[PDB]
Design a protein around this nucleic acid. Structure first.
Ligand SMILES: [Mg+2]
Ligand SMILES: [Mg+2]
Ligand SMILES: [Mg+2]
Ligand SMILES: [Mg+2]
Ligand SMILES: [Mg+2]
Ligand SMILES: [Mg+2]
Ligand SMILES: [Mg+2]
Ligand SMILES: [Mg+2]
Ligand SMILES: [Mg+2]
Ligand SMILES: [Mg+2]
Ligand SMILES: [Mg+2]
Ligand SMILES: [Mg+2]
Ligand SMILES: [Mg+2]
Ligand SMILES: [Mg+2]
Ligand SMILES: [Mg+2]
Ligand SMILES: [Mg+2]
Ligand SMILES: [Mg+2]
Ligand SMILES: [Mg+2]
Ligand SMILES: [Mg+2]
Ligand SMILES: [Mg+2]
Ligand SMILES: [Mg+2]
Ligand SMILES: [Mg+2]
Ligand SMILES: [Mg+2]
Ligand SMILES: [Mg+2]
Ligand SMILES: [Mg+2]
Ligand SMILES: [Mg+2]
Ligand SMILES: [Mg+2]
Ligand SMILES: [Mg+2]
Ligand SMILES: [Mg+2]
Ligand SMILES: [Mg+2]
Ligand SMILES: [Mg+2]
Ligand SMILES: [Mg+2]
Ligand SMILES: [Mg+2]
Ligand SMILES: [Mg+2]
Ligand SMILES: [Mg+2]
Ligand SMILES: [Mg+2]
Ligand SMILES: [Mg+2]
Ligand SMILES: [Mg+2]
Ligand SMILES: [Mg+2]
Ligand SMILES: [Mg+2]
Ligand SMILES: [Mg+2]
Ligand SMILES: [Mg+2]
Ligand SMILES: [Mg+2]
Ligand SMILES: [Mg+2]
Ligand SMILES: [Mg+2]
Ligand SMILES: [Mg+2]
Ligand SMILES: [Mg+2]
Ligand SMILES: [Mg+2]
Ligand SMILES: [Mg+2]
Lengths: 51, 193, 99, 148, 203
RNA sequence: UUGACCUCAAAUCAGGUAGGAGUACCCGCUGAACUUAAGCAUAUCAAUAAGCGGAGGAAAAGAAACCAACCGGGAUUGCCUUAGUAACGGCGAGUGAAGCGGCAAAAGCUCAAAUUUGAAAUCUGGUACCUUCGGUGCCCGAGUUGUAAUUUGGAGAGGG
RNA sequence: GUUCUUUGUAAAGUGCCUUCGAAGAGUCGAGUUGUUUGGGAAUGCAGCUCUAAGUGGGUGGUAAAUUCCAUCUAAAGCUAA
RNA sequence: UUGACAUUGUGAAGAGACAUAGUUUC
């Protein structure tokens, strides 16, 4: 009966996921964070819907 | 073990509590099964819904009479009135209830009318075992959403005959309180030979 | 009823156009019948009065309904049945020995 | 958690910051609220005046819900009306058409009057009013409608 | 029907007739053994409303249980405990005589199932009962759609688990406020209101 | 003398059933003290442990001698709440539930008491035969001190 | 899905008039004693004494007498999730 | 140990009440 799971505020979860999303633009970060994007078209990467 | 300016807490862990401790580790593993076992019913129970038609019903006590909430079953009265014997209407996925009683017209009719809309928006199949497959709406009470009944307009003319409301509340208050004492002052009033 | 319409008063409550429903018989579980009237009155005459019942009727003759109530109020459950019980007697009295 | 915790810091410190002179034994006071009236009485009286004894009447089988009665002040009142529709009424308000508000249906039991509503007629249905409440309603040119 | 008359008559228990009976009957019951089977029931009307039937496989046993309180069976009175519990003599058994009646017979005829039981007579040493039992092996029953419920294994020794009328009484199961303590059936409901509901996302 | 009937016995009578085990969970009985109270007797630990009886895949509860006091609700179980609240207690230490509301799941019913009385309409068993979890013919038995049909309070019955 | 026997001079459903309408006792209840309960002039349980009624009966969380009102129908029974 | 009540029923003389007819009580 340890406290295993955590209650996170439903609204932060968003502000978090949102913030998380905004950075998957931001060249520098994606780069900084692993990810060989050293030379992809433009950030964000948008491929065809045919994918 | 009294110290500092804290509240006085009353935590009841003096029995052998470590023994009866229900962690719901299986919260997930119950949803799933519940889902899994609802689906099998829909599947089994043919093109029928999962629920029965429940009636409106106004809720008890001071607190909750404001609003009107789904019911138990429909009362031999409503049932009859929308033109079916219960015994049958129990096989048409309606909920009946010999215990509820009808003392409210507005609420009566609502039900009996709500009873109409059902017989309408359904279909029964023949006996014959000839299954003309139709496809199931899952939830009767999804299709027939019990709603709150509006009781006025948004705007109207102001009607001030002048009488405080307050004081007619204050007064009604009195009237009840001395209802008894007044009544003895007539009994006693009549006692005068 | 018809309610005042206000939330305290000598007939509190929201006003509604009323309905009054057909009645239950489970609301007559007490009520007599002519069967049970016969069977009960008849079994009486066979089996008769019991120990207290005897001394109850005599109490009523030689000591009014006041001592008879109070007496039987200790014999039986309590006061109200004691009351209805002495009743039964003035009748068994009036019945036979009287009119 | 365990690594921001102090008991990590006291490691190698003999007495765990519990003291050498008077240690950390089992239950010095007694347990819980023991000696309320005796060795721990300074801390009761002050910090907890009133703790011992008894006042009032008993109520057998009280059930709140009985005494239900949210209170709403004139203070708000206009909040009970949905926003857009609200300006509509503030400008252009008099008899003939003044807005109706079901304080019961909002879920309040009583209206108290906590000062200052605009000079606008409003028709107010509630189960209970303050004498002032209902006064400063009249002041606007609304009236109060009593219900259940 | 004769029954309704029997019904009525047995409510005049201190009636001259009935108490003649009651003394001649009670003395007979005493000269037999304590557990002993009866030919026909002695209250056909009562037996029958408790669910009796005159077809094969319906048994009636008659049994004897002493009155009194339960003497705490401690040696010399000796309690070795606190003194709220020094209780030896004014102590009285949660189950009823009738309950201890049903048990001692249902033990006696394991194979039958106890349906129900009714009071017949007491004296100063004894209350006497007739217990009615059903052979749930016996064919006439199994095919009788009305009783064959009894033939299920979940009614094995219903009289010891307190599932007869009397046990259900004793056990305190009725709806409503006078029975909050016992109704869902005491300990189950205790243990309920004595468990710690800890959820995943602690409320 | 022959024939029953009641009650009671006996068979290595014909066919069956109970026991012991297990016991996490369940229905009961019985029943502590360590402990807390800074001592201790009530209280507390606890309607716990030990001991005893009885079931199941769940058990139990269950279609109201209910909750209420409303504009009333409507079998039972469980969860979220109610609430560490109303109440209990050397009113001390400690205790401590219910009605409502949301949800999960939902499902309803059976007798006794009734004259079939122009027909005991009911049933175990034995047996023969067959389409064998059973069916029919037939005999013995059961049963009127009442086996079926009918009715179960929401009703419902009989005449029209 | 099919296929065969039609269970029937059977069985059930509803509308008006009429007469009725049976409903569980050493129980309910009462006193006492012990127990237990949050239940407080007493929550359930049990033992002994007392022991009903049929416009009755139980409940309505402060004892009683009186008058009402409200609500259900005990003392037998089955049942899935 | 002692009293009340329950098991506990049937006669007879004597006491006790409607207050010197016999249902009731020792
Ligand atoms: Mg706890
Ligand atoms: Mg559902
Ligand atoms: Mg078909
Ligand atoms: Mg950490
Ligand atoms: Mg921590
Ligand atoms: Mg560190
Ligand atoms: Mg440090
Ligand atoms: Mg260190
Ligand atoms: Mg060291
Ligand atoms: Mg420190
Ligand atoms: Mg040290
Ligand atoms: Mg020191
Ligand atoms: Mg206190
Ligand atoms: Mg305010
Ligand atoms: Mg036999
Ligand atoms: Mg001990
Ligand atoms: Mg004690
Ligand atoms: Mg004896
Ligand atoms: Mg409790
Ligand atoms: Mg937390
Ligand atoms: Mg043999
Ligand atoms: Mg065993
Ligand atoms: Mg104990
Ligand atoms: Mg402890
Ligand atoms: Mg310990
Ligand atoms: Mg101590
Ligand atoms: Mg100590
Ligand atoms: Mg000590
Ligand atoms: Mg205790
Ligand atoms: Mg144990
Ligand atoms: Mg098994
Ligand atoms: Mg299951
Ligand atoms: Mg079951
Ligand atoms: Mg019912
Ligand atoms: Mg309910
Ligand atoms: Mg405290
Ligand atoms: Mg406790
Ligand atoms: Mg609910
Ligand atoms: Mg069913
Ligand atoms: Mg009944
Ligand atoms: Mg007591
Ligand atoms: Mg005990
Ligand atoms: Mg008590
Ligand atoms: Mg009273
Ligand atoms: Mg009602
Ligand atoms: Mg049955
Ligand atoms: Mg059951
Ligand atoms: Mg099963
Ligand atoms: Mg003596």
């Amino acid at each position: 009966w340890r406290k295993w799971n955590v209650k996170v505020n439903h609204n932060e979860k968003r502000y978090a996921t949102a913030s998380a999303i905004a950075a998957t633009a931001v060249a520098s970060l994606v780069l900084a964070r692993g990810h060989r994007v050293e030379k992809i078209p433009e950030i964000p990467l948008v491929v065809s819907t045919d994918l | 073990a009294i110290s500092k300016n804290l509240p006085i807490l009353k935590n009841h862990f003096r029995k052998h509590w470590q023994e009866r401790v229900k962690v719901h580790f299986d919260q997930a593993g119950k949803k799933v099964s519940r889902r899994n076992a609802r689906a099998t019913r829909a599947a089994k129970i043919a093109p029928r819904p999962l629920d029965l038609l429940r009636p409106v019903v106004r809720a008890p006590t001071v607190k909750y009479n404001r609003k009107v909430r789904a019911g138990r079953g429909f009362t031999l009265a409503e049932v009859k009135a929308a033109g079916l014997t219960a015994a049958y209407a129990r096989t048409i996925g309606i909920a009946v209830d010999h215990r509820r009683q009808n003392r409210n017209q507005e609420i009566f009719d609502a039900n009996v009318q709500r009873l109409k809309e059902y017989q309408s928006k359904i279909i029964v199949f023949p006996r014959n075992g000839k299954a003309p497959e139709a496809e199931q709406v899952l939830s009767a009470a999804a299709t027939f959403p019990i709603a709150q009944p509006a009781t006025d307009v948004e705007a109207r003319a102001v009607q001030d005959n002048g009488e405080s409301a307050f004081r007619t509340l204050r007064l009604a208050r009195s009237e009840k309180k001395f209802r008894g004492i007044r009544e003895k002052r007539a009994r006693e009033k009549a006692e005068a030979e | 009823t018809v309610k005042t319409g206000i939330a305290i008063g000598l007939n509190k409550g929201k006003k509604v156009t009323s309905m009054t429903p057909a009645p239950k018989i489970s609301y007559k579980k007490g009520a007599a019948s002519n069967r049970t009237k016969f069977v009960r009155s008849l079994v009486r005459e066979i089996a008769g009065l019991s120990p207290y019942e005897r001394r109850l009727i005599d109490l009523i003759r030689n000591s009014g309904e006041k001592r008879a109530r109070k007496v039987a109020k200790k014999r039986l459950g309590s006061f109200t049945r004691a009351k209805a019980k002495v009743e039964e007697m003035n009748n068994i009295i009036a019945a036979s020995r009287r009119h | 958690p365990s690594r921001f915790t102090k008991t990590r810091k006291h490691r190698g410190h003999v007495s765990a910051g519990k003291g050498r002179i008077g240690k950390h034994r089992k239950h010095p006071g007694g347990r819980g609220m023991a000696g309320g009236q005796h060795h721990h009485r300074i801390n009761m009286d002050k910090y907890h005046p009133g703790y011992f004894g008894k006042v009032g009447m008993r109520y057998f089988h009280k059930q709140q819900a009985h005494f239900w009665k949210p209170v709403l002040n004139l203070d708000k009142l206009w909040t009970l009306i949905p926003e857009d529709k609200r300006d509509q009424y503030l400008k252009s308000a008099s008899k003939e058409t003044a807005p109706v508000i079901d304080t019961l249906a909002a879920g309040y039991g009583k209206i108290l009057g906590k000062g200052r509503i605009p000079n606008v007629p409003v028709i107010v249905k509630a189960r209970f009013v303050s004498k002032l409440a209902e006064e400063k309603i009249r002041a606007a040119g609304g009236v109060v409608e009593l219900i259940a | 029907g004769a029954y309704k008359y029997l019904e009525e008559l047995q409510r005049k228990k201190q009636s001259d007739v009935l108490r003649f009976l009651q003394r001649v009957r009670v003395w007979e019951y005493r000269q037999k053994n304590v557990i002993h089977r009866a030919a026909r029931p002695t209250r056909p009307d009562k037996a029958r409303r408790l669910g009796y039937k005159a077809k094969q496989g319906f048994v009636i046993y008659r049994v004897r249980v002493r009155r009194g309180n339960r003497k705490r069976p401690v040696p010399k009175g000796a309690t070795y405990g606190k003194p709220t519990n020094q209780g030896v003599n004014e102590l009285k058994y949660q189950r009823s005589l009738r309950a201890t009646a049903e048990e001692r017979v249902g033990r006696r005829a394991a194979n039958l199932r106890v349906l129900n039981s009714y009071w017949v007579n007491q004296d100063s040493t004894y209350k006497y009962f007739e217990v009615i039992l059903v052979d749930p092996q016996h064919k006439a029953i199994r095919r009788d759609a009305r009783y064959n419920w009894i033939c299920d294994p979940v009614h094995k020794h219903r009289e010891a688990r307190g599932l007869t009328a009397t046990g259900k009484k004793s056990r305190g199961i009725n709806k409503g406020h006078k029975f909050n303590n016992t109704k869902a059936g005491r300990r189950k409901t205790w243990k309920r209101q004595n468990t710690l509901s800890l959820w995943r996302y602690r409320k």
